[PDB]
Design a binder for this molecule. Structure first.
Ligand code: SF4
Ligand SMILES: O=S([O-])[O-]
Ligand SMILES: [Cl-]
Ligand code: NA
Ligand code: NA
Length: 406
């Protein structure tokens, strides 16, 4: 009936029931930090592996970290960004908009269909992971996609509408969903409480690797700063041969909910990028500089807009040419996903700051991890997907947009 009820019905089946399916769950980071609040505790007061244990006790056959999907998104979108940059250094338009927030995608399609060509063709992390589970993992385990159920726990309900886009299906059969059911943080919390499960008192469980082999979640130790920042890093580090530090965006004067930064990029010596330098949105042709000796570069102008109302104001200035950016992330909630509409309600005005702070442990925050270094990701491309942006990657991990909405 409801997606929660459908999910629980599948989990209710005995595992030796002939009609039992292989029921998988994936979990967003914003969920892991906020779920403790459903018990009246502080953000982060329950550990990620306590949650994994709780989910396994509900009956899930696989418990995945959505960050695995996010590593795919970083690979694809980093490649996409670099490709667009390359094309515009040679004379797929710039600026490029990210695509992970379904609140943005809905407003894009309904109110800004002329901007569609500028948006990343990448699916979200949850949809990339889901597509891979019902293709690669299904084949590896010898399970018919028909007998796989994919559930995600998300900080917002509208990840369901993302999941429901018709062509997010297996082998062109729209009844065979890549991602079946989305459950929110609060909904999951209520499931635990109704069953007398206290997450804070559980032993640590374990994650499953979407590759179907190896221990753990298939995600390396450390943090990325998110999909937008890591897509940037991927492109930057290839272009320059130098590391991109963790970003610190600064607030824009006289524009609510907008943060920005400028990234100067000098092409790596002897690279093709060094040789290269040597529509509705008025793109100024990029911000370029050059030195006397011939060591010039380009400056990449980046923006993050949180809140759709705030995003509309940014778009107006961009259309007017009063604001120039090359890469832009639009998220529908003011604090981003930690502030999603499926999150617990608090009287604390600073709850989203507490959630953001508890999102990752300090040890992991001191380690920068990079998607292309993940052996599980490497394996998937080497043995199944081929190349980022290739045909197979396009089929499974990329999407399109529909003027007027779906
Ligand atoms: S910003 Fe809000 S609507 Fe968008 S993906 Fe995050 S929680 Fe969902
Ligand atoms: O989609 S809602 O939960 O913000
Ligand atoms: Cl996602
Ligand atoms: Na299992
Ligand atoms: Na495991």
């Amino acid at each position: 009936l409801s997606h929660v009820q459908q999910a629980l019905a599948e989990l209710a089946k005995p595992k030796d029931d002939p009609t039992r399916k292989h029921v998988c769950v994936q979990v967003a980071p914003a969920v892991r930090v906020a779920i403790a609040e459903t018990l009246g505790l502080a953000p982060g007061a329950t550990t990620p592996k306590q949650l994994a244990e709780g989910l396994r006790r509900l009956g899930f056959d696989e418990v995945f970290d959505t960050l695995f999907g996010a590593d795919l998104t970083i690979m694809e979108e980093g490649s996409e960004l670099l490709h667009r940059l390359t094309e515009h250094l040679e004379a797929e338009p710039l600026p490029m908009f990210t695509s992970c927030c379904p609140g943005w995608i809905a407003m894009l399609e309904k109110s800004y269909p002329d901007l569609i060509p500028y948006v990343s063709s990448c699916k979200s992390p949850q949809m990339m992971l889901a597509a891979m589970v019902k293709s690669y993992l299904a084949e590896k385990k010898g399970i018919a996609p028909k007998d796989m159920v994919m559930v995600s726990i998300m900080p917002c309900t509208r990840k369901q509408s993302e999941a429901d886009r018709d062509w997010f299906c297996v082998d062109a059969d729209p009844t065979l969903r890549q991602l079946d059911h989305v459950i929110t943080t609060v909904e999951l919390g209520n499931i635990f409480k109704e069953r007398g499960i206290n997450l804070a008192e559980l032993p640590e469980g374990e994650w499953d690797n979407p590759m179907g082999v190896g221990s753990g979640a298939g995600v390396l130790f450390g943090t990325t700063g998110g999909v937008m920042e890591a897509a940037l890093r991927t492109a930057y580090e290839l272009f320059t041969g130098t590391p991109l530090p963790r970003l610190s965006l600064s607030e824009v004067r006289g524009m609510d909910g907008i943060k920005e930064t400028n990234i100067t990029m000098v092409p790596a010596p002897g690279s093709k990028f060094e040789e290269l330098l040597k529509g509705p949105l008025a793109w100024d042709g990029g911000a370029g500089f050059t030195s006397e000796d011939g060591r010039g570069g380009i400056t990449l102008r980046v923006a993050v807009a949180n809140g759709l109302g705030n995003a509309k104001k940014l778009i107006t200035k961009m259309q007017a040419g009063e604001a120039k950016y090359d890469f832009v992330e639009i998220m529908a909630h003011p604090a981003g996903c930690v502030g999603g509409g499926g999150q617990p309600r608090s009287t604390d005005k600073a709850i989203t700051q507490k959630r953001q702070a508890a999102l990752y442990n300090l040890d992991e925050k001191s380690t920068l991890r990079r998607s292309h270094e993940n052996p599980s990701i490497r394996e998937l491309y080497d043995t199944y997907l081929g190349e980022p942006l290739g045909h197979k990657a396009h089929e499974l991990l990329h999407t399109h947009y529909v003027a007027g909405g779906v």
